[PDB]
């Protein structure tokens, strides 16, 4: 069956190699005859599958690499907790979080950057932050710098431990194949073990530490004399004072009359007006139910005993009439090629990151989070960016799998075979859908702008003119606002407040959430999003499906994954490798994310965020001009892009001045990218040649023969600089604007 088989001490911890670069690649280890060697060295370091031919060694290598990654993550967490401990105003922030700006970074007074340590309130000076740690540290009842300090220490310990574990598992006790390739027990554990018990232990930490101290702070007390956590579990009488049921030990649970615990485990829903956040009772019930669900899920597959399924015994049964034999053998494909798994997991992880970004703003989990505007905004846009990048990586590695490790002779399948057998139909129909959406979602904006600039407003696309109504969205919102009436009696309000029914939650003269109406502008922006997503999918899916062989080049696969072209023959064959398909799709994903985040910023600052008067009149941060100025590109310039770019541009000579400076460098690089994206190579090669002559004239010609970057590396550096410029520009814009006005 399945056992603990491993091997002993393959590679010794000897520095013999560190002084010899490129030991892994036979060609690289010979020596740098030119300068392209030092590019090619970094370029293929992590390329494990091109260093061997057996999956055992590359599996060991990736097992060690995961430990390296985890060590870096732990070190980052430790740095964060430290800087919170020794360099923040966290205690003053806890004193009253309504109007005290979270700052967690000071700068040394050397070169005039003292102005960076701007006024943040609470007798502190420091660069304001928007990471949003403080809402978490108030949720977990840290409420003391000693806790941050010791947590940073423990994080450092875990980091060193993981680094050790890595070194040991690669060098000394290397796992074997029948361990890795055994996915049944891995699924079994990770379902039951990691996620379930994780959520369970967190529910523990919440019901036994957070809930009481948070309730006390909501009652209003200086956290100095707030009783320490362990003094809430050792002596029961405190929790007894809080929750009568909680003073009944464990009888009401075991004896199946769970309703007694109804006080601290409940299903209220909505938000908590004391902090706008979620009712921690609800989130505790959530984490606990999720723990139980993962535990009961974990027991699916047979591992050693006689019960349970087998991932081979599940696929082959499914075989429909149209497709034929079904998923037979697919189990072998997804167990014999790492790149396949990397692609699948990257896709699912990007999608989950996006849905996390979405669910965050509309249901603020933490307390006093939906009122620190910049934090909410920055979190949402960061998660969106991460999701986009993960998705593109998924597509790229899927293409790499399609090229290298796919083969019908032994890694056969009858499903993917059919899929590839009609690729042309797929790409054609997706292309036509892309054209259709492009037309009927952007030409609408063009028509609206034109009919505006021609003095014919009553022929526009808006509520006051020829009208388009997003009826399905309002239908769903009505349903979600009337569902807690009959369908979900156990709830108290709608699942969130953004559903089109209820009241508004406002703390400290500022609003946090309220109903959200949808106008024709929302219809148009949603169709823009749909179109751009469809085009990115078109690019990447075409790349994957045509990575093997196209009707232009018959044997593309033999030429490898990443090569620049196939010469200028047959009318020119530039950018045919799947690698170049990903190079293209990157820009379109960037554009999709950019327009999405702009739409989000405008919609929030024009319909939700803002301040509330003493009487109750709302005056939003931007005045609520969305439904009347999002329908013209010229509007986007005037109402949003130009106007709300003030705070970044007057930012010189103030605390926010750093956000100003980047706003130029971001643009600059942004420029710079074109120089690599537009030019070619031969020109630069000849220029380098003349420069080498000019040097050689002075007996300075270096033996590391200069060489203009190879084509693929040129495109890579170009796209990297371009993404950097764009993202840094929107980053500076967002931070400066929101943290200045809000």
């Amino acid at each position: 069956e399945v056992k603990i088989v491993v091997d002993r001490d393959p590679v010794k911890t000897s520095f013999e190699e560190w002084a010899r670069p490129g030991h892994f690649s036979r060609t690289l280890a010979k020596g740098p005859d030119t300068t392209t060697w030092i590019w090619n060295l970094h370029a293929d370091a992590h390329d494990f599958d091109s260093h061997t031919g057996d999956l055992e060694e590359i599996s060991r290598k990736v097992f060690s690499a995961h430990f390296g990654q985890l060590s870096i993550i732990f070190l980052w967490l430790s740095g964060m907790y430290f800087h919170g401990a020794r360099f923040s105003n966290y205690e003053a922030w806890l004193s009253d979080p309504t109007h005290i700006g979270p700052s967690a970074q000071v700068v040394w007074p050397i070169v005039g950057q003292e102005i960076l340590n701007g006024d943040v309130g609470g007798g502190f000076r420091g660069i304001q932050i928007t990471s949003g740690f403080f809402q978490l540290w108030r949720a977990s009842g840290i409420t003391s710098e000693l806790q941050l300090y010791c947590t940073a220490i423990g994080a450092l310990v875990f980091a060193a431990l993981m680094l050790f574990a890595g070194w040991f598992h690669y060098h000394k006790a290397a796992p074997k194949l029948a361990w890795f390739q055994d996915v049944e027990s891995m699924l079994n554990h990770h379902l039951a073990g990691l996620l379930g018990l994780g959520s369970l232990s967190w529910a523990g930490h919440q019901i036994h530490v957070s809930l009481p101290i948070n309730q006390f702070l909501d009652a209003g007390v200086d956290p100095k004399e707030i009783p320490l956590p362990h003094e809430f579990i050792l002596n029961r009488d405190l929790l007894a004072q809080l929750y009568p049921s909680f003073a009944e030990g464990a009888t009401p649970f075991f004896t199946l009359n769970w309703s007694k615990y109804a006080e601290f485990l409940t299903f209220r829903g909505g938000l908590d007006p004391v902090t706008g956040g979620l009712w921690l009772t609800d989130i505790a019930h959530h984490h606990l139910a999720i723990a139980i669900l993962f535990l009961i899920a974990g027991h699916m597959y047979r591992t050693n005993w006689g019960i349970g399924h087998g991932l081979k015994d599940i696929l082959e049964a499914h075989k429909g009439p149209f497709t034929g034999q079904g998923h037979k053998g697919l189990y072998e494909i997804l167990t014999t090629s790492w790149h396949a798994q990397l692609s699948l997991n990257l896709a699912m992880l990007g999608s989950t990151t996006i849905v996390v970004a979405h669910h965050m703003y509309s249901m603020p989990p933490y307390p006093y989070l939906a009122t620190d505007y910049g934090t909410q905004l920055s979190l949402f846009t960061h998660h969106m960016w991460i999701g986009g990048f993960l998705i593109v990586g998924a597509a790229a590695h899927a293409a790499i799998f399609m090229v290298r490790d796919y083969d019908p002779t032994t890694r056969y399948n009858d499903l993917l075979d059919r899929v590839l057998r009609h690729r042309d139909a797929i790409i054609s129909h997706l292309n036509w859908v892309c054209i259709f959406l492009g037309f009927h979602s952007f030409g609408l904006y063009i028509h609206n702008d034109t009919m505006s600039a021609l003095g014919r407003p009553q022929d526009m696309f808006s509520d006051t003119a020829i009208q388009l109504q997003p009826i399905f969205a309002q239908w769903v919102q009505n349903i979600h606002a009337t569902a807690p009436g009959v369908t979900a009696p156990g709830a108290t309000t709608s699942t969130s407040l953004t559903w089109g029914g209820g009241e508004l939650v406002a703390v400290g003269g500022k609003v946090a959430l309220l109903p959200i109406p949808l106008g024709t502008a929302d219809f148009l922006v949603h169709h823009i999003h749909a179109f751009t997503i469809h085009v990115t999918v078109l690019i990447l899916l075409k790349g994957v499906l045509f990575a093997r062989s196209s009707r232009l080049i018959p044997d593309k696969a033999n030429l490898g994954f990443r090569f620049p072209c196939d010469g200028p023959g047959r009318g020119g064959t530039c950018q045919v490798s799947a690698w170049d398909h990903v190079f293209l799709g990157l820009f379109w994903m960037y554009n999709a994310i950019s327009v999405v985040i702009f739409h989000f910023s405008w919609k929030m600052q024009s319909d939700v965020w803002g301040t509330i008067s003493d009487q109750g009149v709302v005056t939003h941060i931007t005045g609520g001009n969305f439904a009347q100025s999002s329908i013209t590109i010229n509007g986007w310039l005037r109402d949003f892009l130009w106007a709300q770019a003030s705070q970044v541009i007057q930012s010189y000579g103030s605390s926010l001045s750093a956000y100003g400076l980047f706003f130029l460098g971001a643009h600059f690089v942004w420029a710079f990218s074109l120089m690599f994206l537009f030019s070619g190579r031969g020109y630069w090669q000849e220029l380098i040649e003349s420069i080498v002559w000019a040097h050689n004239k002075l007996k300075v010609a270096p033996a590391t023969q200069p060489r203009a970057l190879s084509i693929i590396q040129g495109r890579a550096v170009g796209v990297t600089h371009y993404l950097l410029g764009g993202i840094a520009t929107t980053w500076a814009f967002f931070l400066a604007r929101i943290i200045a006005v809000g």
């Binding site: 600039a453 003095g455 100003g660």
Partner: protein, 73 residues
């Protein structure tokens, strides 16, 4: 670049405030603020949801530029 320089110089001289040019023309952000941002504010409001103006064409044409250019990429 040449035409930027000439146009900013003259558009300051005509309003009699060459002082502003001489002060805030030495730092790029000064160019992006005093020359482009401000002097474009009469343009981008050529046509708004409250009507249009004589400047309409230019505003329209202006955007036209920032489109055709992009298509070149």
């Amino acid at each position: 670049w040449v035409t930027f320089y000439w146009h900013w110089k003259h558009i300051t001289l005509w309003q009699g405030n060459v002082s502003q040019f001489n002060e805030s023309s030495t730092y790029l952000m000064g160019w992006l603020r005093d020359y482009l941002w401000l002097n474009s504010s009469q343009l981008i409001n050529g046509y708004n949801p409250f009507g249009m103006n004589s400047l309409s064409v230019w505003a329209w044409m202006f955007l036209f530029g920032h489109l055709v250019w992009a298509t070149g990429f």
